[PDB]
Write a protein that holds these residues in place. Sequence first.
Motif, PDB file in Angstrom:
ATOM      1  N   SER A 283       0.805  -1.218   0.000  1.00 30.92           N
ATOM      2  CA  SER A 283       0.000   0.000   0.000  1.00 30.92           C
ATOM      3  C   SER A 283       0.844   1.278   0.000  1.00 30.92           C
ATOM      4  O   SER A 283       0.881   2.006  -0.993  1.00 30.92           O
ATOM      5  CB  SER A 283      -0.922  -0.021   1.220  1.00 30.92           C
ATOM      6  OG  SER A 283      -1.532  -1.296   1.368  1.00 30.92           O
TER       7      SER A 283
ATOM      8  N   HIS B 271      -7.006   4.323   4.559  1.00 31.88           N
ATOM      9  CA  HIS B 271      -6.674   3.026   5.134  1.00 31.88           C
ATOM     10  C   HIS B 271      -7.926   2.188   5.330  1.00 31.88           C
ATOM     11  O   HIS B 271      -7.875   1.094   5.887  1.00 31.88           O
ATOM     12  CB  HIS B 271      -5.909   3.178   6.455  1.00 31.88           C
ATOM     13  CG  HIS B 271      -6.613   3.989   7.498  1.00 31.88           C
ATOM     14  ND1 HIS B 271      -6.374   5.333   7.689  1.00 31.88           N
ATOM     15  CD2 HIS B 271      -7.541   3.639   8.418  1.00 31.88           C
ATOM     16  CE1 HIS B 271      -7.121   5.773   8.684  1.00 31.88           C
ATOM     17  NE2 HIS B 271      -7.840   4.765   9.139  1.00 31.88           N
ATOM     18  N   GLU B 272      -9.049   2.712   4.873  1.00 34.33           N
ATOM     19  CA  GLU B 272     -10.294   1.967   4.885  1.00 34.33           C
ATOM     20  C   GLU B 272     -10.660   1.571   3.465  1.00 34.33           C
ATOM     21  O   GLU B 272     -11.062   2.413   2.662  1.00 34.33           O
ATOM     22  CB  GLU B 272     -11.415   2.780   5.526  1.00 34.33           C
ATOM     23  CG  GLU B 272     -11.131   3.152   6.971  1.00 34.33           C
ATOM     24  CD  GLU B 272     -12.340   3.726   7.673  1.00 34.33           C
ATOM     25  OE1 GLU B 272     -12.524   4.959   7.630  1.00 34.33           O
ATOM     26  OE2 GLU B 272     -13.108   2.943   8.273  1.00 34.33           O
TER      27      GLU B 272
ATOM     28  N   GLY C  69      -5.165   0.056   2.279  1.00 37.33           N
ATOM     29  CA  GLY C  69      -4.883   0.809   3.494  1.00 37.33           C
ATOM     30  C   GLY C  69      -3.451   1.323   3.590  1.00 37.33           C
ATOM     31  O   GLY C  69      -2.940   1.957   2.669  1.00 37.33           O
TER      32      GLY C  69
ATOM     33  N   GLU D  18      -0.523  -0.371   9.493  1.00 40.05           N
ATOM     34  CA  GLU D  18      -1.874  -0.651   9.954  1.00 40.05           C
ATOM     35  C   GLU D  18      -2.254  -2.097   9.650  1.00 40.05           C
ATOM     36  O   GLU D  18      -3.398  -2.509   9.856  1.00 40.05           O
ATOM     37  CB  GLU D  18      -2.868   0.331   9.330  1.00 40.05           C
ATOM     38  CG  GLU D  18      -2.620   1.768   9.765  1.00 40.05           C
ATOM     39  CD  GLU D  18      -3.673   2.736   9.270  1.00 40.05           C
ATOM     40  OE1 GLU D  18      -4.739   2.842   9.911  1.00 40.05           O
ATOM     41  OE2 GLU D  18      -3.430   3.417   8.255  1.00 40.05           O
TER      42      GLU D  18
ATOM     43  N   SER E 212      -2.259  -3.842   6.713  1.00 44.38           N
ATOM     44  CA  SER E 212      -3.128  -4.009   5.563  1.00 44.38           C
ATOM     45  C   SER E 212      -2.324  -4.079   4.266  1.00 44.38           C
ATOM     46  O   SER E 212      -1.888  -3.054   3.736  1.00 44.38           O
ATOM     47  CB  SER E 212      -4.143  -2.862   5.513  1.00 44.38           C
ATOM     48  OG  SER E 212      -3.504  -1.605   5.684  1.00 44.38           O
TER      49      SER E 212
ATOM     50  N   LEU F 150      -7.339  -7.633   0.237  1.00 42.76           N
ATOM     51  CA  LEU F 150      -6.572  -6.915   1.238  1.00 42.76           C
ATOM     52  C   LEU F 150      -6.515  -7.756   2.504  1.00 42.76           C
ATOM     53  O   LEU F 150      -7.479  -7.812   3.269  1.00 42.76           O
ATOM     54  CB  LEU F 150      -7.199  -5.550   1.535  1.00 42.76           C
ATOM     55  CG  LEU F 150      -6.341  -4.612   2.385  1.00 42.76           C
ATOM     56  CD1 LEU F 150      -5.167  -4.082   1.581  1.00 42.76           C
ATOM     57  CD2 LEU F 150      -7.174  -3.465   2.920  1.00 42.76           C
TER      58      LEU F 150
ATOM     59  N   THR G 225      -5.174  -9.002   6.173  1.00 42.84           N
ATOM     60  CA  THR G 225      -4.760  -8.349   7.398  1.00 42.84           C
ATOM     61  C   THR G 225      -3.681  -9.147   8.114  1.00 42.84           C
ATOM     62  O   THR G 225      -3.618 -10.374   8.000  1.00 42.84           O
ATOM     63  CB  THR G 225      -5.960  -8.155   8.344  1.00 42.84           C
ATOM     64  OG1 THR G 225      -6.640  -9.404   8.532  1.00 42.84           O
ATOM     65  CG2 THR G 225      -6.928  -7.125   7.786  1.00 42.84           C
TER      66      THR G 225
END
Length: 157
Positions: free
Chosen positions: A8, A117-118, A133, A137, A139, A154, A156
Amino acid sequence: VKRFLLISDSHVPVRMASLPDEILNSLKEYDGVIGLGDYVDLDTVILLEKFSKEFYGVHGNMDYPDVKEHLPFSKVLLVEGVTIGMCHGWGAPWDLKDRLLKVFNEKPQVILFGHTHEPEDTVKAGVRFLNPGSLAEGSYAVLELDGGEVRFELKTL
């Protein structure tokens, strides 16, 4: 199944440095690493080409311009029909669609922009914009190719 590793937004070292190198070690399994956020050391850029041995980068980061000779300000990929227009930076909801259609004279099918980041699947002006994101964070985005489709996951940490 070919798979693109999308990172990202990376700022290393700069003032973060807190990037889990585990994923960087896993470039072996990624026949294509996509960097929207780059490593700001030119030395590390070559190291990127060492780990991945093939990466596609888009330099829209506020760091060293030296890295911009390895990855341009904007890049489009042609992946099994899907035109991926990747551009790292910023823009207002209004400006974004118009500016990107200005930068890219021919409309991209899917555009990758990192800033929020959402993650949300956003269709603006008939273009599909995907937003990953951030680094610290937890992501990262894995694009998996199956049946000739670019599939955005994406994942986590």
